[PDB]
Amino acid sequence: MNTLKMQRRIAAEILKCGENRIWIDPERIDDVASAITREDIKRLIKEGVIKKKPIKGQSRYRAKIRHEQKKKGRHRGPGSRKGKKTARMGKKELWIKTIRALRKELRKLKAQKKIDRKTYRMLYIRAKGGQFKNKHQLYLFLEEHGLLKK
Amino acid sequence: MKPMYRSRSWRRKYVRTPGGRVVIHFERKKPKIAHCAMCGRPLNGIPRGRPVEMRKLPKTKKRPERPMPHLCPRCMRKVMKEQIRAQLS
Amino acid sequence: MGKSLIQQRRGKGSPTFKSPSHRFRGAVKYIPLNYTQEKTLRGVVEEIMHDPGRTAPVARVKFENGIEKLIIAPEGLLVGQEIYIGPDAPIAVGNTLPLAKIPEGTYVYNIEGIPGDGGKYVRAGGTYALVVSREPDKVIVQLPSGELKAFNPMCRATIGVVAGGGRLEKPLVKAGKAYYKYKARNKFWPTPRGVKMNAVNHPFGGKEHHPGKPTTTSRRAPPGRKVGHIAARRTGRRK
Amino acid sequence: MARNKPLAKKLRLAKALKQNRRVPVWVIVKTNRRVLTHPKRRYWRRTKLKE
Amino acid sequence: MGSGTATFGKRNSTPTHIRCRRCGRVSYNVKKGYCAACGFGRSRRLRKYRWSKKWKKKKNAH
RNA sequence: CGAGGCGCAGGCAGCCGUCGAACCGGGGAUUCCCGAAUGGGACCUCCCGCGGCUUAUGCCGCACUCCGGGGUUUAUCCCC
RNA sequence: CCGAUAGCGAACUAGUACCGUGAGGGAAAGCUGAAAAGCACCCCGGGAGGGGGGUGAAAAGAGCCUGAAACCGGGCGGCG
RNA sequence: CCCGAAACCGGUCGAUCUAGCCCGGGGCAGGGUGAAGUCCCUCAACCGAGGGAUGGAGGCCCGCUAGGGGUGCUGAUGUGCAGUUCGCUCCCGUGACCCCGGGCUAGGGGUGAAAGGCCAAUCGAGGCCGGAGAUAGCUGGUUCCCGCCGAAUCAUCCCG
RNA sequence: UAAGGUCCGGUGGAGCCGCCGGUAUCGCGGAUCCUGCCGGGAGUAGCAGCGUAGUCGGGUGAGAAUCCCGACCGCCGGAGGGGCCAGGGUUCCACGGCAAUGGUCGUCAGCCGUGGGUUAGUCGGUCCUAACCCCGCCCGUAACUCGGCGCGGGGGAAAGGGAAACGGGUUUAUAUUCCCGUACCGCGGGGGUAGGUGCGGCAACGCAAGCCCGGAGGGUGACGCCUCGGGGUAGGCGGACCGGCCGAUGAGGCCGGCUAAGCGUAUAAGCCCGGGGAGUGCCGUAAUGGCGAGAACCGGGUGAAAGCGCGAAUGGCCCCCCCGUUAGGGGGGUUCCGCCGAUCCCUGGGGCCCGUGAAAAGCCCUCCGGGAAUUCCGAUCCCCCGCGACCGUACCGAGAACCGACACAGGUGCCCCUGGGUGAGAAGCCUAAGGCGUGUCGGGGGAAACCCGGCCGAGGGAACUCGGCAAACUGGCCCCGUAACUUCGGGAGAAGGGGUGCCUGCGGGUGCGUAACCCGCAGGUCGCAGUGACUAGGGGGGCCCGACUGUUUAAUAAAAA
RNA sequence: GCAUGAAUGGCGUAACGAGGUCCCCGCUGUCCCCGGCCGGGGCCCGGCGAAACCUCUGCCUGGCGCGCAUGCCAGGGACC
RNA sequence: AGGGGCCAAGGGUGGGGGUGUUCACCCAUUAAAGGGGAACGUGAGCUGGGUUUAGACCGUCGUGAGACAGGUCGGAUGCUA
């Protein structure tokens, strides 16, 4: 008899919510028992006898404070670190990063006229060959040379 | 769908219903580059499309105007030089 | 007594001992229905592929009567080389002509043994036959083994050498890489020894490492007992 | 899918299902105690089949 | 194979044997295309033998 | 044979039968699909090349392999 | 000749239930009474269970003719 | 008299288990090391020397990723949860790797990284049926009563 | 004597003796006999061991620890959740029950009884062909329901190849299928016009295709391995705005804010094209490297995903304020801005090789064109009329629907592998969506001995034992440093020593402008301990064997074999 | 060398191993010598409910005996 | 301090190192570190190293299969009274 097991599944599909979220009023068990249809469930939804729990969300406060602190250089001493050095930052990947600016830098300078077709070749080629630390170093080393400085 | 394994004809885009159901759809594989074949180069003015799609699409895509749309203009650049030498003698 | 042996299985044509024929590539044909005399025939190297089961590279050739067939590739071939077949083919590398028409003392491969059967001789990587002497009666050719066989002068052959030399110069490296090669070919492996095989499994050798009866076997010995050094004339490396 | 019955196999399955009834009470009266037990009763789980 | 029989037995799952077009017994092996009982697929004839099998059901039927 | 029946199977209900049932004999109608299964394959289903005919759906007849005889571009291909 | 632990695999729901991938393998299961009158009516009981009354006769009351032994309760005699 | 086993043989039936072979697919967190190959700087006439980068190989390492295996505990169980299991620990974990579906090979045959292992709770030659009520000098059993007489367990011969 | 005969009482309610002559599937205590029935064992063991789950009110009913509702307390987090293949076969769904079934009760259920449900032009089957198979024919065999070749045909993947569709709504049960909306395949008409069977642009090239039966040819269909980089966006999170909620103080947090397939219009790194013309030879990529068979460098063209609009004010979320036993409803307002970080998916290079990595159906083009053409023709352009032969769809898909006889701790494929916190992580723990409390027997004894899992042990530090077996210890990460030996590759993470937390304030890198992260530095300071948990190698040396990796007695031997 | 020896491979060997054996350092309930704790059983109750196996049974010691006895024989213990 | 003998089992008669070892060998202690029986006590108690399974190697033997109380690594320990 008195099902109600299906009526929950059915209510679940109409409400488009989880079974576990369904709230049936305790005073009105008899009224939900007499609910056979979805249309009945829908009536009972309007009358507020069948409801939905709210979906939670995990708080990110604790994340946020850490994230700001790690953005600021904190919580990252030698005592928080778990992976090996490259692990945090991929040695190929950083370099892949490193060289592109040294090249952008020279490229920017190629359009600006500051460096002749004649310096750039040595520099661009020097950048593939890893002389530069990078942005600050490239600027310094050419500045020493004289042609950048001009 | 009925294919589960991520087989070749299977491959997937995420699809949203607004229902917020979010269901997987199969996608048709992405186009391999038709060749000249007389010398291996991907052909300008030759489409890419899926081999089914070419049936219900247009023919303009499927060729360039010059003879032998299948081969590249430079390879044809050989072939006419030969054809005349052939009519001449 | 014991089961059929490792070799006896082979002969059945059962599938562990059946060559794949569906990953493997064409055979050589020269075709004699357009004959050698009254030639008509040149062709163009359409592509070059590796043939898995020959362990050598092979050529697809597009003939000018409209037939497509493979010819075993010579060294120093280009794609778009012209290969000719006939006697009125030029005398150069990759060109195919009868033995009589080929000079004496030139290197040659892909020699016929019955005229017009398409090549049944010298079709391996980097090895070559030498035409030592020629007489209108018979032309004697010196084989890869050092050994001289007399062939009809109206056999076909191709001038040059086979490609894919150095083949055994490079080693096979490991048991893995080797496993990989044998799948590409057909050759029952991993192959163990009879010596620690049980008395049922194999004619020689017992439970532990030592041979039963002598390894050296008759030339009238039975099937299934003809294992070891087969009809050995000598053995060893000493007086 | 489905799987993935063949049309006929469904006809056969349907038959076995039919065999898996319980007789009716009236036959039983007509018999006046009686053939009972219905002997075929096949349980989905309990038994197999044929296919 | 030997013991650990529970651990082993996930095949049978696949079927290779049915109600036969010809006889109706449980042996038309889908893979071979042969009925073990009747011999359909294999032979124009019904399987019957001196031992028998086929005969035994028939006599039993009489 | 002939005055009750409606298989095994005693129920409930209703029915049929002298223009003679049930039953027995002889003859005839219908006799799915698979099967030697014959057009082809199949896990008892499915597809298909002709020709007849009704306006169409519907419906009727056909094509595996011998022998016997034909037809003809004598395709050895098709028809009785 | 045997007579239902027997005789046919099978007195019946048998070549069934069931087993086995398959080839194949394969049981058990008979008895009311004169008539079903197959349990109305009445009392009780949650009660589809069960008890009293109701049949010529219910150790004839529903696998119901008879109704053993092992064995189980109670009671009688004896011992304890 | 009855029963009793390991066989042998003949015809059949299995590769939905499992072994290898083939087709066509799929799976495998993360991390390390760092080859060839390529580049540059400084120092040297050259010979080279020092430094750094880039690239990224492996029947490779670490790994309780999934997955595969199964070393020790001789632990737990041992009429089980289980006719081969459990936990910790342990090996492998881009591979001579694992896996799915199709398909091939059958009983003195196959198959075997070969242990006489495996070929469907059955393998130093599978199972089913028949021969078959095999035959055994060998074990077990062989059932009503009564009356009368009442043993030998030795000899010769014998693949005994 | 006896084997056995005979009489009485009770029971039973139709067949039965004696004598004489016959005959036998003719007499039972044993056969680890065979079959059938039954007791003790016992009211015992099991109903425990694996990551140990329930509990209070209340509803229902004869009966409630295990049925339902709420609250409260937990586990699970690639699975005890979601979608599915095989396989099962009505287990699905409703109503009525509990004799049986469910490792216990049962009012529940997968049981029993009775009814009902799987709807397809656009999903897949079906088609193709693979490895391979069969048939006829040829032939063999004494012969076949046997046998291999050669011909000819036919069959072979419900995860290969392949024509076309999604969203929303509805049902007790079904749905991409029924409905609504939007979209569209195939074939077959019709009506127009490009089309004197295409016009127009030097060119790199423009679309409103190219009359036509036929066969031919040619591309694409079409396939091994692994990096790296380029794009897509599912989507995780901060800020701001709009409501709902929770709420010491009225803050902070939680939550809803969505956009489909189909179209139209745009893709762009590869790849061609003009101009130009390689000066110590220049230039690029993350990288190898390109170039005088066309550089550097300028304009073009050209072929994946992607954006917008249509689709779509809708629809779907989310609230508000009124109608009420009830039914059926009504009117409202929000339905948003960025910037930022990611699996996969698609696209170039590149590295590899004693695996050099199936076909065809179909498209697209081209050659020829049997014929019909100027009263013409044709319909790739539009728009529009008609139609859809056949099978399948339920549910489960699992620590109760599979298989193992069992609802068996077993073990069988995929997909969700990118939820949040963590941290190298598809790891652990915790936690979200989602699921469950039927990995189905409860309660009691503070529960003693004993047994399993596990925790802790002074002093001593293997004295135990065949043996340090078991167990312990080390432990993440960073820095320092690193021997013997050596096939120079390695040994090596040797070894040993140091450090590691929080806070406060800085600097560097990448970028854009203060985002998203990451790497360092200094000061202040607490604890016994900063990998405080979880995660997490003990090390060193000699010798024997076998080179290694792998394999092995599937199930007492993993080894030296 | 009771009874080694060179492809029925000899010797030697870096690297490698869930391989055999030995030593050292740390460490440690393996041990001297065990305790306490914790959770699941044990144990009781309620409901549920099997198996192995079954001539019988209150002995112990000696003697005897198929020479390795509860049952014979002699003592002793002996309430269920 | 011994040697040798009598009475006497009440009590005591150990710990380690090698070996699978009962025995025995050794070390340092000790009063002394006695011997033998109980299914060569003790597996419905443990342990399972050794003996005598099925894997493997060496030596010897043997034509060979194959063998060894020769040497050697590995090789399960059931039950609810």
Swiss-Prot record, chain A:
* InterPro entries associated with the record: 60S_ribosomal_eL19_sf, Ribosomal_eL19, Ribosomal_eL19_arc, Ribosomal_eL19_CS, Ribosomal_eL19_dom, Ribosomal_eL19_dom1
The disulfide bridges present are none
**Statement: the UniProt record of this protein carries the keyword RNA-binding:** yes
Keyword Ribosomal protein tagged: yes
Segments for region (Disordered): 55-89
SMART domains in the cross-refs: Ribosomal_L19e
Q: Which GO terms describe its cellular component?
A: cytosolic large ribosomal subunit
Q: Which GO terms describe its biological process?
A: translation
Question: What are the UniProt keywords, alphabetically?
Answer: Ribonucleoprotein, Ribosomal protein, RNA-binding, rRNA-binding
Q: Which residues form a coiled coil?
A: none
Q: Which Gene3D superfamilies match?
A: 1.10.1200.240, 1.10.1650.10
GO MF? large ribosomal subunit rRNA binding; structural constituent of ribosome
Family label = Belongs to the eukaryotic ribosomal protein eL19 family.
- Please give the subunit comment from the record: Part of the 50S ribosomal subunit.
**Which NCBIfam families did the record assign?**
PRK08570.1
Function, please?
Binds to the 23S rRNA.
Q: What is this protein called?
A: Large ribosomal subunit protein eL19
UniProtKB/Swiss-Prot annotation, chain B:
Database matches in InterPro entries: Ribosomal_eL34, Ribosomal_eL34_C_sf, Ribosomal_eL34_CS, Ribosomal_L34e_arc-type
Isomerase among keywords: no
Domain of life the protein comes from? Archaea
Disordered, as annotated region: 45-71
State the coiled-coil residue ranges.
none
Q: Which GO terms describe its cellular component?
A: ribonucleoprotein complex; ribosome
Please give the Pfam families that the UniProt record associates with this protein: Ribosomal_L34e (PF01199)
One Gene Ontology term from the biological process aspect of the record: translation
The alphabetized UniProt keywords are: Ribonucleoprotein, Ribosomal protein
Molecular-function GO terms, alphabetical = structural constituent of ribosome
Q: Which HAMAP family match?
A: Ribosomal_eL34
Subunit structure comment from the entry: Part of the 50S ribosomal subunit.
Report the sequence similarity comment from the record: Belongs to the eukaryotic ribosomal protein eL34 family.
Spell out the protein name for this chain. Answer: Large ribosomal subunit protein eL34
Organism classification, top ranks?
Archaea, Methanobacteriati, Methanobacteriota, Thermococci, Thermococcales
UniProtKB/Swiss-Prot annotation, chain D:
Q: Which UniProt keywords apply?
A: Ribonucleoprotein, Ribosomal protein
Domain of life of the organism in this record? Archaea
Q: Which Gene3D superfamilies match?
A: Ribosomal protein L39e (1.10.1620.10)
Q: Does the keyword Zinc-finger apply?
A: no
GO biological process annotation, one example: translation
GO molecular-function terms, A-Z: structural constituent of ribosome
Q: Which GO terms describe its cellular component?
A: ribonucleoprotein complex; ribosome
Show the PROSITE patterns listed in the entry.
RIBOSOMAL_L39E (PS00051)
Q: Which Pfam families match?
A: Ribosomal_L39
InterPro entries found in the cross-reference section: Ribosomal_eL39, Ribosomal_eL39_CS, Ribosomal_eL39_dom_sf
Xref: HAMAP family: Ribosomal_eL39
Q: Which family does it belong to?
A: Belongs to the eukaryotic ribosomal protein eL39 family.
Q: How does the annotation summarize its subunit structure?
A: Part of the 50S ribosomal subunit.
Protein name according to UniProt:
Large ribosomal subunit protein eL39
* Species the sequence originates in: Pyrococcus furiosus (strain ATCC 43587 / DSM 3638 / JCM 8422 / Vc1)
UniProtKB/Swiss-Prot annotation, chain E:
The entry marks the following residues as binding Zn(2+), namely: 20, 23, 35, 38
Family under the similarity heading: Belongs to the eukaryotic ribosomal protein eL37 family.
Q: Name one GO biological process term.
A: translation
- Subunit structure and binding partners: Part of the 50S ribosomal subunit.
Q: Which UniProt keywords apply?
A: Metal-binding, Ribonucleoprotein, Ribosomal protein, RNA-binding, rRNA-binding, Zinc, Zinc-finger
Cofactor(s) of this protein: Zn(2+)
The record's Gene3D superfamilies line, in alphabetical order, gives: 2.20.25.30
Cited function: Binds to the 23S rRNA.
| UniProt keyword annotation of Glycoprotein present | no
Q: What is this protein called?
A: Large ribosomal subunit protein eL37
Alphabetical GO CC annotations of the entry are:
cytosolic large ribosomal subunit
Cofactor binding notes: Binds 1 zinc ion per subunit.
Q: Which organism is it from?
A: Pyrococcus furiosus (strain ATCC 43587 / DSM 3638 / JCM 8422 / Vc1)
Residue ranges annotated as zinc fingers (C4-type) are: 20-38
Under Gene Ontology molecular function, one entry of this record is: zinc ion binding
